[PDB]
Design an enzyme around this catalytic site. Structure first.
Site, PDB file in Angstrom:
ATOM      1  N   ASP A 182      45.450  31.087  35.979  1.00 15.56           N
ATOM      2  CA  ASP A 182      45.408  31.425  37.392  1.00 15.56           C
ATOM      3  C   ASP A 182      45.405  30.145  38.228  1.00 15.56           C
ATOM      4  O   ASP A 182      45.558  29.036  37.710  1.00 15.56           O
ATOM      5  CB  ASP A 182      44.198  32.316  37.684  1.00 15.56           C
ATOM      6  CG  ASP A 182      42.897  31.713  37.200  1.00 15.56           C
ATOM      7  OD1 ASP A 182      42.931  30.618  36.608  1.00 15.56           O
ATOM      8  OD2 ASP A 182      41.836  32.339  37.406  1.00 15.56           O
TER       9      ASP A 182
HETATM   10  C1  LIG Z   1      27.809  20.247  47.012  1.00 15.13           C
HETATM   11  C2  LIG Z   1      27.750  21.438  47.964  1.00 15.13           C
HETATM   12  C3  LIG Z   1      29.101  22.130  48.231  1.00 15.13           C
HETATM   13  C4  LIG Z   1      29.238  23.546  47.612  1.00 15.13           C
HETATM   14  C5  LIG Z   1      29.253  24.728  48.627  1.00 15.13           C
HETATM   15  C6  LIG Z   1      30.418  25.755  48.466  1.00 15.13           C
HETATM   16  C7  LIG Z   1      29.998  27.233  48.161  1.00 15.13           C
HETATM   17  C8  LIG Z   1      31.157  28.274  48.026  1.00 15.13           C
HETATM   18  C9  LIG Z   1      30.966  29.395  46.952  1.00 15.13           C
HETATM   19  C10 LIG Z   1      31.346  30.837  47.408  1.00 15.13           C
HETATM   20  C11 LIG Z   1      32.739  31.000  48.076  1.00 15.13           C
HETATM   21  C12 LIG Z   1      33.719  31.949  47.364  1.00 15.13           C
HETATM   22  O1  LIG Z   1      33.762  32.027  46.164  1.00 15.13           O
HETATM   23  S1  LIG Z   1      34.850  32.982  48.407  1.00 15.13           S
HETATM   24  C13 LIG Z   1      36.042  34.070  47.450  1.00 15.13           C
HETATM   25  C14 LIG Z   1      37.096  34.747  48.363  1.00 15.13           C
HETATM   26  N1  LIG Z   1      37.772  35.929  47.795  1.00 15.13           N
HETATM   27  C15 LIG Z   1      39.121  36.237  47.994  1.00 15.13           C
HETATM   28  O2  LIG Z   1      39.796  35.479  48.687  1.00 15.13           O
HETATM   29  C16 LIG Z   1      39.714  37.491  47.356  1.00 15.13           C
HETATM   30  C17 LIG Z   1      41.251  37.516  47.148  1.00 15.13           C
HETATM   31  N2  LIG Z   1      41.715  36.561  46.135  1.00 15.13           N
HETATM   32  C18 LIG Z   1      42.599  35.509  46.440  1.00 15.13           C
HETATM   33  O3  LIG Z   1      42.966  35.430  47.608  1.00 15.13           O
HETATM   34  C19 LIG Z   1      43.079  34.511  45.350  1.00 15.13           C
HETATM   35  O4  LIG Z   1      43.219  35.329  44.243  1.00 15.13           O
HETATM   36  C20 LIG Z   1      42.048  33.396  45.014  1.00 15.13           C
HETATM   37  C21 LIG Z   1      40.677  33.999  44.748  1.00 15.13           C
HETATM   38  C22 LIG Z   1      41.991  32.457  46.207  1.00 15.13           C
HETATM   39  C23 LIG Z   1      42.487  32.558  43.713  1.00 15.13           C
HETATM   40  O5  LIG Z   1      43.794  32.321  43.734  1.00 15.13           O
HETATM   41  P1  LIG Z   1      44.810  32.271  42.194  1.00 15.13           P
HETATM   42  O6  LIG Z   1      43.874  32.983  41.249  1.00 15.13           O
HETATM   43  O7  LIG Z   1      46.020  33.024  42.675  1.00 15.13           O
HETATM   44  O8  LIG Z   1      44.997  30.790  41.939  1.00 15.13           O
END
Ligand SMILES: CCCCCCCCCCCC(=O)SCCNC(=O)CCNC(=O)[C@H](O)C(C)(C)COP(=O)(O)O
Ligand SMILES: CCCCCCCCCCCCCCCCCC(=O)OC[C@H](COP(=O)([O-])OCC(O)COP(=O)([O-])OC[C@@H](COC(=O)CCCCCCCCCCCCCCCCC)OC(=O)CCCCCCCCCCCCCCCCC)OC(=O)CCCCCCCCCCCCCCCCC
Ligand SMILES: CCCCCCCCCCCCCCCCCC(=O)OC[C@H](COP(=O)([O-])OCC(O)COP(=O)([O-])OC[C@@H](COC(=O)CCCCCCCCCCCCCCCCC)OC(=O)CCCCCCCCCCCCCCCCC)OC(=O)CCCCCCCCCCCCCCCCC
Ligand SMILES: CCCCCCCCCCCCCCCCC[C@@H](O)O[C@H](CO[C@H](O)CCCCCCCCCCCCCCC)COP(=O)(O)OCC[N+](C)(C)C
Ligand SMILES: CCCCCCCC/C=C/CCCCCCCC(=O)OC[C@H](COP(=O)(O)OCCN)OC(=O)CCCCCCC/C=C/CCCCCCCC
Lengths: 52, 459, 98, 178, 55, 110, 128, 124, 80, 55, 67, 88
Positions: free
Chosen positions: L43
């Site tokens: 991915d």
């Molecule tokens: C040192 C301190 C810094 C740390 C702080 C940071 C904390 C952040 C942690 C929580 C944030 C998240 O996870 S927020 C997760 C957001 N969810 C979505 O966007 C659902 C739809 N999925 C997609 O758009 C793509 O599949 C994708 C997932 C982008 C992958 O891409 P590929 O699979 O096509 O490569």
């Protein structure tokens, strides 16, 4: 000019400017050898309080 | 001192009788010889002046100014022959004629024993300068620049003429020696106050005093390179010379009439130095530099002490040399890229290293690095002002910091960074330009080696 | 995702041209065609300068008053003066806190 | 630095950029390798927990929350590669870079040394002079009537064409010029 | 100082991650002296030297 | 101070040059064994900077501290001087622990 | 949840912390497309002259010319005497002069009064 | 330190003032006091050019140490007995100063308590 | 000159703190797919290193031996 | 590529520092003062194509 | 001296650098031990610091709370 | 002197070394033209981790816009060679 993207292919790399684009009135104040307005980790009005 | 005046008058028909392709060579060689001859005027006495005749005399204040004028003529000739190559022979001869006439008027101005003759010559210097600016300038602003240069000067100078003829009707003489020996104090009356103002304002506008300087950026930017050289190096010093001459008859009224001009000089020094920090035109920056240095000279003349007079003389000579060098340095880049904007051509140290060295030395002398005569004059004036009042050091101190800032800003903007990609017509420096810079800079350090030759009669 | 065929092809051609240029930047074996004792450092950099300095100080600088000034040498009890031959007495019979 | 940008970034592009930034700043906080691996695996699990959200509104809300948390908890002095735009050697060698057109002004005595180099230079210049008009005409053909909409350039397609606007990309000074 | 620094450097080996305090932010960012004194005085000086002195 | 400060900067420059112009201590690993002479010099310089007895630093810093203690002086200045001379050892320790102890953290092309 | 960061003039708001870029509209996408089109057209116009083999000189930039002209020559024609303009001009051009005049006059009057009474300690003051 | 805590927290009335000291006559509590003598002449100290601060009552030991140092120049490890003698004299001087400070504190505490209790006697 | 990379299969997290990290991520149902890329920092000549106190007393043994023999020579040299 | 210049620059700084240290009057001391200042300015911006060095 | 890159192995060390490093560490430790053995007073103080409380009123000359 | 003159073969060897130290990629099934999404079934997050691993190996960062595009080891090697002026 410090806030502009450094990974872009600017016509003038040092000045981070593109040919023909409108130039800020205060460019010479912002040439990045000078006053910088880039975002900081700690907020302004909090750095001032701690320093004072 | 006809042994100097007559050879210049001979430069005139020598130029007008030369072959079409030897005018520059002949003018340069004989101008340099005349400068060598004028070098003999530096042998001055300790008590009185050299009184050649009833008409001409040489003091320890005017001899370095005459030497500077005669030395500046050949440099202007070398600086002019590049951009005048496409001009016809007659117009080139007319340009050289204008320069020669300007030198002759300047030489006679600094040695006239009477104030009316001095006035006539110091006003005759206007016509060649105005003609040069309005005929051989590049842009359409040159006409307005000529008008500003003319009327600012004349509006100050005409009341001086009225005051001079009045003084001659009152005391019977305008001869400077008689004026000095038969000096009498000025009372505190409105008539005397206006006489003081009439005797002072023309020289104030020549310096020029802050608030009366708007003509200077126009005239010094719109002129050709030789015009700028002679406007910054010699013509501004007419005001200082005339003020030190005329202040002999203004005591004790000066003791309090100097306050507005002193405040204007100090604050406008700060203001013009600050203006130099945000300037898009490279020549206007050098012009405002001249304004700041001349404000210092005005302060020194107004406080009326031996140390301030010594500092004023040294600073005038040093500024003439430094500002002429800076104007030539800017003109080289202008001739390369046909633009005066400072941030157009950058990273020039990569393309022109020796010219970068010349830039560094010129900007180091501009900020008065010791033991240059720039710093000798500035420090003498600062010490005199401190004795006048201990609070001047703050204003003087701010100025020193600001001057360094804008000088190095100019240097870093023009020489460092990365060269602009689109400009590919930056040819190597010619031998002529390097010789011009060397002939500007070497006399400065040589004079540092022996500083009593530029310290004036109060030494 | 990734490149498109146009970008891939253009990058390929530019890469070939750039490598050709970088190869052409190399110097052939003849490229720099140039056209047509032991302790002498201690003599021309130490001895000669100190000769000029000592001569300048001994016969020119010291030819005027107050040009070379040396603080007076310390005098201690029990010393004798070179010029006068005077000797300085001892120091007031120490209490001998042994 | 080599690819033409797009009019905007997409949601997945923003998520990937935030993921890289968070991993780098966490490595800045976790100096040692094993601790960094532990917390990087934790971060990856946290990122892929909400990977399957079909509501884009809540996805962008989560992205907003994550960006706010990153800004609160970023390292004030993160590690930068020495030649990256904030590194200690970012533009160190820019003063040694000299454009190729400066060679046109060398004195003939200077060009007397290096004859073969200048012969190759003449060949390259002739190539550019011959290819310029074909490049210009290809750009004229491939450009939509309302001007270009991106900064991407077409490649060469014909027999011995060259990709248009190539001279200043191919003849870069160097990365370590002197 | 030796012992306290040694303890505070040994605790970096633990598999524990906590966000920094304000004291650490003050120490690392040099008390915010360059962040404020290189932005406020310079900005006001340059802005005043354009808006008021020149224009 | 001239001696050991110059030599400390020189050892720092040696480490920087060896690791491909890298200055961040977070990417400097175990150089105690990989850099024996540099490690020895940096340890000696750190011990001298901290005023270890009979070293160059000691014949000045020790007397300075003991003369600050026996004078009619501002008390806050004395307290800040003592806290600073503790922080000196603390910062010196940080360089040694981070730069010379532990496991490598620099790129693999050694 | 976490403490909030508020932007200032000399410390601006980050792009990733900007609410306006997290609630978007097709109008915004259209605007971004137009902005990119204008930028690309200017870039192509520049690059066409930049790579031109027969071009010797400086490529003229109308933006630079407009900037310098606006900063220098366009100012007075667009000036109107307003209460704000008049007050700022009077203040910043008049106040410093009389402030420094008052300071220097007071200092010199004090010094002269001290000299008159014969108590200034002018011993060794040979040079002025 | 404890004297600083005693003065800035306890009763500052009976604590000696380092700037204003002593406040009692030098012969107040003592029946007679010997005048402290000096070994090195003013002329000797001037000739040795010691310092305005090293010209204390231990100056003679310093003069001896300086003479021995100049005499034993290349062997810069031979001036140990003279250095020890000078240090011993300076230590005795510091001991005397400590004694002076000690004397001032007891007199102040004793005098003020005695006069306040005499006032108490006069209050009844 | 002319040196090739070592075999990539000798890098194992076996017996290094990466082992412990893998165990604690297995206790949570996670996995660490990059440990072998970090195994070289522990594998070979970087396996062990001194402590801070061990580093400070680097050449204490030889210096102490020289000091002791010199002191003995001093003590049985004054017997002249 | 400019090591010769670098060595010349270092030597120049040393000369100005000796002038500062051995000066007997305030003007000579000021000469040394400003000389070492200018030498440090030139040596800090040794890589003059880098904006941060000039700053 | 020629030392070639190693790529994820401990770098090549020449005998002379270890010899020099160990020699200088040893000479530093010897200097410290020797200078402490001969100049212990420079660290431990040389003269006994007295206690004011144990000074009799006879030598300090304070009156017995009567006069 | 300084570091040796990096060549394309060395770049490819190091890239393949790093990729074969990845647990989610089988060594033998990996080839120099293997695609990350199609052939290897990774991915986007795995691609980001691979880009960061490349950055660590060569000691220099790669911009995100450029990083997103590379999909096979050939593209990574080509980008590295073009960046560092490697022609042999
Ligand atoms: C040192 C301190 C810094 C740390 C702080 C940071 C904390 C952040 C942690 C929580 C944030 C998240 O996870 S927020 C997760 C957001 N969810 C979505 O966007 C659902 C739809 N999925 C997609 O758009 C793509 O599949 C994708 C997932 C982008 C992958 O891409 P590929 O699979 O096509 O490569
Ligand atoms: C102090 C040392 C004393 C030395 C003794 C002998 C000195 C002889 C020098 C004679 C005068 C110099 C000539 C000026 C023009 C420059 C020549 C040129 O164009 O370069 C081509 C030439 C050819 O080489 P290149 O490869 O082509 O390089 C060209 C590139 O552009 C690259 O070029 P670059 O990168 O190499 O840079 C060129 C160089 C040259 O550029 C310059 O800036 C040199 C000019 C000096 C600064 C001018 C303004 C400052 C005001 C000070 C005034 C002092 C003058 C005193 C009177 C001198 C009379 C001539 O600039 C610098 O390197 C640094 C400049 C900063 C100087 C800081 C020192 C401040 C004052 C220190 C003390 C001064 C008083 C001494 C006594 C004090 C009390 C004991 O370059 C050189 O050979 C190097 C120049 C030599 C450096 C001189 C710097 C120190 C001398 C100061 C004045 C002399 C004092 C003598 C009294 C004895 C003491
Ligand atoms: C026996 C007689 C003598 C008695 C002496 C005193 C007796 C007590 C002994 C204990 C002395 C202190 C012991 C340690 C102190 C704290 C250690 C520490 O690191 O704490 C961690 C903690 C932060 O840890 P972290 O950020 O999680 O760690 C970073 C990561 O681990 C990331 O790690 P990293 O790799 O980035 O490393 C971070 C780094 C840096 O760590 C930090 O970021 C924090 C640095 C804290 C240490 C600062 C020590 C010096 C303090 C000077 C303060 C001057 C006045 C400041 C006034 C501020 C005014 C606003 O850590 C270190 O390198 C080690 C730090 C220093 C260790 C050695 C300390 C020696 C000096 C102190 C002991 C002196 C001993 C001799 C005393 C002789 C006296 C005669 O900092 C603290 O909370 C304690 C610092 C003390 C601040 C108190 C200031 C008051 C705050 C509230 C203000 C209230 C305002 C009221 C209203 C106002 C209205 C206007
Ligand atoms: C933009 C830059 C231009 C150049 C600057 C030129 C500077 C010119 C300023 C002139 C300096 C002083 C002029 C007159 C000297 C004293 C001024 C007066 O205010 O002082 C008092 C004068 O008192 C009152 O002020 C009366 C004067 C009031 C009328 C003057 C008009 C001032 C209004 C400002 C107009 C701006 C003038 C400049 C035009 C640009 C002193 O009291 P008094 O003892 O009784 O008079 C002394 C003369 N005596 C002895 C013969 C009697
Ligand atoms: C005494 C009279 C004046 C005293 C000083 C008062 C303030 C002076 C204001 C100066 C205005 C100058 C404007 C233009 C300067 C040039 C532009 C400029 O320097 O921009 C800032 C530039 C770049 O910022 P960096 O942080 O380095 O970022 C680099 C990485 N990107 O950095 C600087 O140079 C800023 C320097 C400004 C310092 C001004 C503040 C100093 C005030 C000192 C007060 C304390 C006095 C000391 C008392 C001592 C006890 C007796």
């Amino acid at each position: 000019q410090q806030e502009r993207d450094p990974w872009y292919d600017w016509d003038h790399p040092d000045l981070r400017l593109n040919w023909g684009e409108p130039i800020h009135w205060d460019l010479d104040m912002y040439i990045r050898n000078r006053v910088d307005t880039s975002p900081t980790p700690v907020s302004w009005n909090t750095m001032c309080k701690h320093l004072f | 001192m006809l042994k100097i005046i007559i050879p210049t008058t001979m430069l005139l028909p020598m130029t007008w009788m030369s072959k079409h392709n030897m005018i520059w060579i002949n003018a340069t060689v004989h101008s340099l010889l005349i400068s060598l001859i004028s070098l003999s005027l530096l042998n001055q006495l300790g008590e009185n002046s050299l009184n050649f005749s009833l008409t001409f005399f040489s003091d320890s204040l005017s001899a370095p100014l005459l030497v500077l004028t005669t030395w500046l003529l050949p440099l202007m000739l070398m600086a002019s022959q590049s951009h005048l190559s496409k001009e016809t022979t007659t117009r080139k001869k007319l340009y050289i004629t204008m320069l020669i006439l300007l030198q002759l008027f300047l030489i006679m101005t600094f040695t006239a024993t009477e104030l009316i003759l001095f006035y006539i010559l110091f006003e005759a210097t206007l016509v060649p300068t105005l003609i040069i600016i309005t005929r051989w300038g590049n842009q359409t602003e040159r006409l307005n620049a000529g008008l500003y240069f003319l009327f600012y000067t004349l509006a100050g100078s005409l009341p001086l003429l009225v005051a001079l003829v009045y003084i001659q009707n009152t005391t019977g003489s305008l001869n400077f020696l008689i004026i000095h020996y038969w000096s009498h104090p000025l009372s505190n009356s409105w008539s005397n106050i206006f006489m003081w103002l009439a005797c002072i304002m023309a020289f104030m506008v020549k310096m020029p005093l802050y608030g009366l300087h708007l003509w200077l950026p126009k005239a010094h930017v719109e002129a050709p390179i030789a015009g700028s050289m002679v406007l910054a190096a010699v013509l501004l010093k007419l005001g200082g010379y005339g003020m030190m001459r005329i202040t002999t008859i203004l005591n004790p009224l000066t003791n309090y009439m100097a306050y507005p001009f002193l405040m204007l000089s100090m604050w406008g020094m700060i203001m013009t130095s600050s203006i130099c920090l945000r300037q898009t035109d490279l020549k206007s920056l050098i012009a405002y530099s001249s304004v700041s240095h001349m404000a210092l000279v005005i302060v020194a003349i107004m406080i009326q002490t031996p140390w301030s007079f010594m500092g004023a003389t040294a600073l005038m000579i040093a500024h003439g040399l430094t500002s002429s060098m800076l104007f030539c340095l800017a003109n080289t880049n202008y001739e390369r890229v046909h633009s005066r904007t400072m941030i157009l051509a950058r990273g020039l140290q990569t393309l022109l290293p020796l010219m970068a060295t010349w830039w560094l030395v010129a900007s180091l002398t501009n900020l008065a690095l010791p033991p240059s005569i720039n710093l000798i004059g500035e420090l003498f004036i600062i010490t005199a002002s401190f004795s006048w009042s201990n609070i001047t050091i703050i204003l003087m101190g701010m100025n020193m910091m600001i001057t360094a800032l804008y000088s190095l800003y100019m240097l870093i903007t023009t020489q460092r960074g990365k060269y602009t990609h689109h400009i590919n017509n930056i040819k190597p420096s010619f031998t002529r330009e390097n010789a011009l810079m060397a002939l500007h800079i070497l006399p400065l350090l040589l004079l540092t080696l022996n500083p009593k030759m530029i310290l004036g009669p109060l030494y | 995702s990734g490149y498109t065929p146009d970008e891939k092809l253009r990058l390929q051609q530019l890469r070939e041209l750039r490598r050709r240029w970088l190869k052409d930047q190399e110097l052939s074996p003849r490229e720099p065609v140039l056209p047509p004792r032991h302790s002498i450092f201690a003599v021309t950099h130490v001895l000669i300068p100190v000769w000029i300095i000592h001569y300048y100080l001994k016969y020119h600088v010291t030819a005027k008053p107050y040009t070379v000034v040396e603080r007076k040498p310390r005098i201690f009890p029990g010393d004798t003066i070179l010029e006068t031959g005077e000797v300085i007495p001892l120091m007031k019979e120490f209490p001998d806190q042994h | 630095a080599f690819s033409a940008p797009a009019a905007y970034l997409t949601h997945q592009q923003k998520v990937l950029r935030l993921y890289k930034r968070a991993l780098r700043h966490l490595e800045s906080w976790c100096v040692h390798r094993d601790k960094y691996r532990y917390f990087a695996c934790l971060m990856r699990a946290r990122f892929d927990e909400h990977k399957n959200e079909k509501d884009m509104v809540k996805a962008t809300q989560l992205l907003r929350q994550a960006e706010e948390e990153f800004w609160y908890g970023q390292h004030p002095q993160p590690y930068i590669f020495p030649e990256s735009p904030g590194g200690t050697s970012y533009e160190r060698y820019e003063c040694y870079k000299v454009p190729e057109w400066c060679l046109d002004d060398w004195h003939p005595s200077e060009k007397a040394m290096y004859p073969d180099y200048f012969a190759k230079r003449e060949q390259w210049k002739r190539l550019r002079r011959e290819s310029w008009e074909r490049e210009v005409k290809q750009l004229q053909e491939e450009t939509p009537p309302g001007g270009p909409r991106t900064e991407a350039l077409p490649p060469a397609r014909k027999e011995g064409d060259l990709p248009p606007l190539w001279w200043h990309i191919v003849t870069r000074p160097r990365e370590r010029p002197m | 100082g030796f012992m306290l620094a040694l303890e505070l450097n040994n605790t970096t080996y633990y598999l524990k991650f906590k966000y920094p305090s304000q004291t650490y932010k003050f120490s690392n960012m040099l008390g915010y002296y360059p962040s404020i004194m290189h932005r406020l005085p310079t900005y006001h000086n340059l802005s005043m030297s354009q808006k008021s002195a020149s224009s | 101070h001239a001696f050991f400060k110059a030599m400390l900067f020189m050892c720092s420059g040696s480490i920087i040059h060896s690791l491909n112009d890298e200055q961040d201590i977070r990417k400097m690993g175990g150089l105690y064994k990989a850099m024996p002479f540099t490690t020895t010099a940096l340890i000696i310089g750190s011990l001298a900077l901290t005023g270890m007895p009979y070293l160059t630093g000691f014949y000045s810093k020790d007397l300075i501290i003991e003369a600050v203690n026996m004078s009619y002086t501002n008390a806050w200045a004395l307290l800040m001087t003592l806290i600073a001379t503790s922080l000196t050892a603390a910062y010196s320790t940080r360089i040694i622990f981070f730069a010379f102890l532990g496991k490598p953290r620099f790129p693999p092309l050694v | 949840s976490f403490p909030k960061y508020k932007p200032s003039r000399l410390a601006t708001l980050p792009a990733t912390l900007d609410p306006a870029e997290y609630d978007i509209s097709p109008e915004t996408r259209k605007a971004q497309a137009e902005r990119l089109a204008i930028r690309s057209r200017l870039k192509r116009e520049y690059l066409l002259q930049y790579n031109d083999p027969n071009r010797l000189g400086v490529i003229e930039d109308p933006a630079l010319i407009r900037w310098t002209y606006a900063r220098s020559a366009n100012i007075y024609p667009n000036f109107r005497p307003t209460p704000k303009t008049s007050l700022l001009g009077a203040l910043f051009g008049i106040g410093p002069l009389f402030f420094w005049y008052y300071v220097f006059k007071t200092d010199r009057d004090k010094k002269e009064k001290l000299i008159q009474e014969g108590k200034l300690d002018q011993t060794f003051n040979i040079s002025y | 330190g404890a004297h600083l805590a005693r003065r800035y927290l306890g009763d500052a009335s009976k604590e000696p003032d380092p700037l204003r000291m002593p406040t009692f006559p030098p012969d107040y509590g003592f029946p007679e006091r010997k005048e402290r003598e000096m070994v090195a002449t003013q002329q000797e100290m001037n000739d040795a050019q010691l310092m305005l601060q090293q010209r204390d009552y231990c100056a003679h030991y310093l003069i001896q140490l300086l003479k021995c140092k100049r005499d034993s120049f290349p062997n810069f490890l031979a001036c140990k007995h003279e250095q020890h003698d000078w240090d011993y004299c300076e230590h005795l001087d510091y001991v005397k100063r400590m004694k002076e400070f000690e004397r001032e504190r007891r007199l102040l505490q004793r005098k003020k308590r005695r006069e306040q209790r005499e006032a108490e006697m006069a209050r009844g | 000159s002319k040196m090739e990379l070592p075999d990539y299969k000798q890098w194992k997290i076996e017996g290094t703190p990466l082992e412990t990290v893998q165990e604690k991520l297995a206790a949570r149902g996670l996995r660490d797919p990059w440990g072998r890329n970090e195994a070289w920092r522990y594998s070979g000549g970087f396996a062990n290193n001194v402590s801070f106190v061990g580093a400070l007393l680097k050449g204490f043994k030889w210096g102490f031996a020289a000091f002791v023999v010199a002191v003995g020579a001093e003590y049985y040299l004054e017997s002249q | 590529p400019f090591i010769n210049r670098f060595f010349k620059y270092l030597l120049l700084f040393l000369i100005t520092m000796m002038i500062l240290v051995t000066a007997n009057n305030l003007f000579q001391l000021f000469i040394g003062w400003e000389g070492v200042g200018i030498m440090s300015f030139l040596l800090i911006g040794w890589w003059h194509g880098r904006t941060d060095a000039n700053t | 001296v020629h030392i070639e890159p190693r790529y994820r192995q401990f770098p090549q060390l020449t005998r002379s650098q270890l010899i020099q490093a160990e020699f200088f560490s040893a000479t530093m430790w010897f200097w410290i031990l020797w200078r402490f053995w001969h100049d212990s007073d420079a660290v431990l103080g040389h003269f006994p610091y007295p206690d004011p409380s144990q000074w009799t009123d006879e030598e300090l000359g304070i009156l017995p709370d009567d006069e | 002197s300084d570091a040796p003159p990096l060549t394309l073969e060395a770049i490819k060897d190091r890239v393949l070394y790093v990729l074969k130290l990845y647990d989610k990629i089988d060594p033998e099934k990996l080839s120099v033209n293997s695609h990350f999404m199609k052939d290897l079934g990774l991915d986007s997050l795995d691609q980001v981790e691979i880009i960061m691993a490349m950055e660590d190996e060569f000691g220099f960062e790669i911009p995100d816009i450029d990083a997103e595009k590379l999909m096979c080891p050939q593209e990574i090697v080509d980008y590295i060679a073009d960046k560092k002026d490697v022609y042999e």
